[PDB]
Paper text:
We have recently identified a periplasmic protein AztD in Paracoccus denitrificans, which is able to transfer zinc to the cluster A-I SBP AztC23. Here, we describe crystal structures of AztD homologs from P. denitrificans (PdAztD) and Citrobacter koseri (CkAztD), a pathogen of the carbapenem-resistant Enterobacteriacea group. In each case, the protein adopts a beta-propeller fold composed of continuous antiparallel beta sheets forming 8, 3-, and 4-stranded blades and containing a disulfide bond between highly conserved Cys214 and Cys231 (P. denitrificans numbering). Two high-affinity zinc-binding sites are identified, only one of which is competent for transfer to AztC.
The crystal structure of CkAztD has two monomers in the asymmetric unit while PdAztD has 4. Site 1 is present in the central pore of the protein and zinc is coordinated by His124, His167, His218, and a solvent molecule. Site 2 is contained on an extension from the body of the protein composed of the N- and C-terminal beta strands and a beta hairpin from blade 2. Zinc is coordinated by His99, His102, Asp104, and the side chain of the C-terminal His408. Zinc ligands at both sites are highly conserved in ≥95% of AztD homologues with the exception of His408, which is only conserved in 68.1% of analyzed sequences. All zinc occupancies refined to > 0.7 in PdAztD and 0.4 in CkAztD. The crystal structures do not allow us to determine whether associative transfer of zinc to AztC occurs from PdAztD site 1, site 2 or both. The mutagenesis data clearly demonstrates that zinc is transferred exclusively from AztD site 2 to AztC, leaving one to question the function of the highly conserved site 1. The cooperative nature of binding between sites 1 and 2 suggest that site 1 may function to tune the overall zinc-binding affinity to the needs of the organism.
Residue numbers in the entry:
A (entry chain C): 32 to 96, 104 to 187, 192 to 408
B (entry chain A): 28 to 185, 192 to 408
C (entry chain B): 31 to 99, 102 to 187, 192 to 408
D (entry chain D): 28 to 186, 193 to 408
Write the structure that this text describes.
Amino acid sequence: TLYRVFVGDHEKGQVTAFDLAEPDHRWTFPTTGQVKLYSVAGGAVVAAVQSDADTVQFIRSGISFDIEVGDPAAIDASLTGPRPFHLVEHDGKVVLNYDQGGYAEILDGHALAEGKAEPGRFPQARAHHGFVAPLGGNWLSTVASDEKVSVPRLGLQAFDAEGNPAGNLATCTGIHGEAFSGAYLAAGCKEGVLTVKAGANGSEYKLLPYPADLPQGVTTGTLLGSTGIQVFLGNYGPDGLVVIDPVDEPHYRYIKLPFRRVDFALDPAKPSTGYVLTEDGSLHRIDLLKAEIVASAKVTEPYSMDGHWNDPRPRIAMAGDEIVVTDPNAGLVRRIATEDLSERGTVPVEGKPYNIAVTGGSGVTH
Amino acid sequence: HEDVTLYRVFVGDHEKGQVTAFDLAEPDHRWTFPTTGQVKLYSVAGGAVVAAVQSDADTVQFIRSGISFHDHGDHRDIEVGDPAAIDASLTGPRPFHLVEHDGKVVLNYDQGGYAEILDGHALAEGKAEPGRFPQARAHHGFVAPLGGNWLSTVASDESVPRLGLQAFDAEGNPAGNLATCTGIHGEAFSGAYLAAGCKEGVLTVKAGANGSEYKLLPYPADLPQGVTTGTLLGSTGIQVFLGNYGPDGLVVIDPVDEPHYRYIKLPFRRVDFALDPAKPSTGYVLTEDGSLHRIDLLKAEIVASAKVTEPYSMDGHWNDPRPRIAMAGDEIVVTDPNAGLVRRIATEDLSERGTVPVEGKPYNIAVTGGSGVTH
Amino acid sequence: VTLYRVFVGDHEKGQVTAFDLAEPDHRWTFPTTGQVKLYSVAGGAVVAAVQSDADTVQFIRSGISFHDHHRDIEVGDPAAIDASLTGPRPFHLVEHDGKVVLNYDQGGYAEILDGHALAEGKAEPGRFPQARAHHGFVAPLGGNWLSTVASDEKVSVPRLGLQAFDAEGNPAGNLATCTGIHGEAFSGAYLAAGCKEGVLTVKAGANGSEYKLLPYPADLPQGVTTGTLLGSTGIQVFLGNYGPDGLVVIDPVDEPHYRYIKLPFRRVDFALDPAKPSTGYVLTEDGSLHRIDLLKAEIVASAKVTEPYSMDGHWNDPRPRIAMAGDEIVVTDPNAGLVRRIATEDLSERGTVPVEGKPYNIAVTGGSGVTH
Amino acid sequence: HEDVTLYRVFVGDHEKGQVTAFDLAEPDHRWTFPTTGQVKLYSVAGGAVVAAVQSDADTVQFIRSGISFHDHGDHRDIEVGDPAAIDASLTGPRPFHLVEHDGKVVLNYDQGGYAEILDGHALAEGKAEPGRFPQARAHHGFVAPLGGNWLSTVASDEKVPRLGLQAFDAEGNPAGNLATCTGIHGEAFSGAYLAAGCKEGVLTVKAGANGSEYKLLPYPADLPQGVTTGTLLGSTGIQVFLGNYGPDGLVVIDPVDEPHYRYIKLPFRRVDFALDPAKPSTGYVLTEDGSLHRIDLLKAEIVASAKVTEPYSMDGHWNDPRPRIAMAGDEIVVTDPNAGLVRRIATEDLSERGTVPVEGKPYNIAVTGGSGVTH
Ligand SMILES: [Zn+2]
Ligand SMILES: [Zn+2]
Ligand SMILES: [Zn+2]
Ligand SMILES: [Zn+2]
Ligand SMILES: [Zn+2]
Ligand SMILES: [Zn+2]
Ligand SMILES: [Zn+2]
Ligand SMILES: [Zn+2]
């Protein structure tokens, strides 16, 4: 097996890649600005969205799945536009929201994997901080209000390729955050969590309103979907999580955090578990079956969640039986064992390592 | 539709039986309430009620804020009217420490051997008739609601020495064994925990399935010797306590994991402190040189300081006229008794945004209000 | 029980008089090789009597000891320690981190004693080597030994500054400039020392000694320096002289680092009040004692306690010396043959203690504790 | 007929009484001048003279530039020779702020209770003969020529608060009423206006037929509270001032039209700033992280940034060794005390075009010269 870690800097436009098992096998790729990294097209491509720099660039991992392995390589075709931000990949498509452009860009995943980045433009009625998700042959876009001044958002709506409605608007006030699991897309709302099921008889919309038992005045705005069981992990305020079952009641099981959340991830190698890093520097194992934190260990120094959302703070990603955690002030990436959260080693990375993504896995060569 | 923010500050005098209230952002909107004697002030019932404990004068009076928040509600409604006295007192021998939790306000009568229980919601609707909680003996203690029980301090048989803490029923019948906490003093809630200061360390109790779960956190041998934690604050945002440790120290207390204590050495002796609920990884401590310091609770260190008053030496009596601080959103309000004013300090950078004149020697302070929605 | 025991040296004879403050007829006399400068050491269990002119350092057991099990006090008669140190011109004494360190001005080394061993009656020193003999000091800090360092001028020895060493004199970092370095004290996290350029501060750091010079502000009187420092034990602040007729309250952390106090006459002696750490006391050459508010950096009360003792002439002429004993200041009065007791509360004279000779240097041991 | 450009930079040491001069484009053409103490440098008399005010050393000395320009109908001719000390010096108790206007150079003696008035032309021909302007009381102030009057700051009596600004004749006889400007500090000219910083806002004055015309620009309520403008630059292009507003803010101040204020939040605290006379509305500000930022004065925003020095925290005393900046045509020159150099930064793109080594810890800076004609 081969995991290749891709680490961004907090300030410089730079992506560092290294083989997890031999960090001396390393590469550097230049970018226009600060990167937020996404493993896409099955891990054959890393997308480096640079919101502040109106740019999106791509890097070949280049691990393709049998597994074929070569050195990573930049894709020179890039993308430019006004504040690309949220990236959604589903049904073989990568979709990029341009927050200050009022449109999204649709890329074919296979085409990216062969080094081509020629997008089709999806029009939106108004520019805003949104996303566009492929589902059931439609493009499900967030929809802003026409009310003037940060743009208020009304909900989610299915559209065709030309940006004409393919279904009615589903109310989801302030819609934010999205994930897929099983047959379901989920998105965070002021009223609860909106689910859409790609079903045999078409798309099924159902809002799951927040139960009265949940803390008041706070919402789910960030979602992860398990790849193994049909369940979502969402935040619920800065100091809580909800395990969300989209099918049966009760839809929500709340988990109280003792410090505020810095980042989290679900373990694709152990689909009934995830990890959450909190501002005291502790990484916690989440048992999705029990809906509780079941183990913790301090892995970084504290990083207060007070201040600005994009300040330098640790980011996490999964790589096999390890969690990789960037530590910007320490200039390094820490490797934590999923088995018992022991520290297996560190990897020096120059500068302030910030965002992170992982590609690869286990395969056959013959 | 407007988000409305409105903080109303309540200031007691060091000598006069007087509470001054004013709108923080509009200090000419102000009111004065007479009291029997020197007040110690507490915001209770979500800020709908200010309790004015007057220990030396054996009474507690209440003032309606009257800023109240109500859940419509996909959100929070704010209702604003003039403050107004509640005519109904509580009366007794030297009430002192006040505890609010699980919707109850509880007052300890140091010279009476009982505490009085008031319902928070009933106070906010203007009623102050308490239910009595009997104690085996009079002492300087407290009674805290927890897990359906009443956790009271307990005196010895011999200032009255105190043995520890114990869970009781409403009639004062024991609901569990005494938890040793010698000289028990100071208390606060954070996350799942009640904490109280002891001679041996800090006692924690959490509501458990078989009742309250007690655990003593012993003071490490590293800590300066001969001094203890006797005053505690609990964060409402994260699960952590801040206590003093001697006159010139603080401890950040983690109730869960080791290390339970992280010591912060203050450069001058402590006058007052407060935690910032709007920025829960931070607090503020005022020291006797007149400096206000921002506390990083996560790293347990002082991270910024500025001189905000003239010095107020900690030599002399604990109740001499000295500043008191309270939080009001993105400001700390600091009373300055000798100057006749309350100072407004920005939490962002510790700059002084302005001052508010208050007659006399403004002493104790409490804050009501916040942010909400109208219609 | 509270018990303060005063130790008074003579200006000429090698003699220390000890007496219980509350009953001065409970007294003892100890001979010494020569004129003493007295230091309360090992928490008050031991008095060190440095005799610079006589190449000797002798010790006297207090003997008041506190067994911080609140705190227990044990009281017995004071007693000489028979083991003494001898060497060329011992002078400045520093106590910190359980170590008492003596600088031999004409020996080019210092002697390190363990405070605990002294309190149990043993005086076996270790030798700290220096590059060159000079009037300096050696201070423990963060596992290192911060020694003053002389120049190679020829040949009073000019001094370059302060430098960290290990116990054998191997350098642990570069020398920090502090020209004519003189005076030292600890308060809070800081060591401070006086320089021509200002006051050098040093903190124990993760990677070793962390130096920071505070240069004298231009608003301060010119041509004069801080050469004598006291450090508070209850707050983090230093009191230094600044010239013969000024004081500076020194904040090692924030600006302003210096706050000047003009004295009405030149300074004879000063001390900080450990029982009231925001206050100190300064005696001026007119014979007045002044209370210093360290927080406000000002004199807040004055009273005449002795006849004048001009600061003209030699620095070691017979002059009053002061020390704290609970709620009193004790003031030697060499010409009157007395120790005067001054109440800190209101600076009135609570009494006198007649002593043989010309009482000069003074130190206080004891305090308050519990008995059973 | 030849267009010649030649800038001559003058740099003071932070410690030594020393001014270094060098031709910007050929730094090996350089000169050194001794002074009594630490200098603050001012280009005066069209750049023919550098004034070296030494506040701590109770001295002011002058250096002939000596690059001078001479009007020539269509254009200016440039005259170039070596610089040279002016032998006449001035002494007095703490000379500090210097104002030049209407051909007069005026120096405020902070601890003397007067200012000295010098004629620019006499200075340019090498004479330092001051005229006396008396003040009611010594203070940290300034005296500005305007409309035939002398506008002096005015202190209180007491025993120092400053009350405002007042117009006088040359004898110190009041020519108008006191204009309130509490704590008045900082001044600049732009167009018809003198401006000065106040606790209440920014005071502006224009020369009118009935004497000085005052109008205070009160700080808008939207601005951060409790902080002030105390340092002002006057634009030669649009008619606007650039002031600080707190340690980490700027305001573009329009004395004629609303909005009178446009606020700029700096990412770190301000070290120094300057306006670019080659452009109608561009300035430069150096912040404590070592970044130089280009300010668009009409949009009131930072439009470009680059790191130019190591960090120099604004913690500590204002007069500690820190970079200072000045304009030289299409470059900014930045002193770098720790690096021992002056850095040349291109205004077009903020790149480092070169450095010039200077002895010691280069601190304050002034620039003389420019573009002119030779025949
Ligand atoms: Zn195969
Ligand atoms: Zn977002
Ligand atoms: Zn509502
Ligand atoms: Zn109490
Ligand atoms: Zn005992
Ligand atoms: Zn000496
Ligand atoms: Zn010409
Ligand atoms: Zn000034």
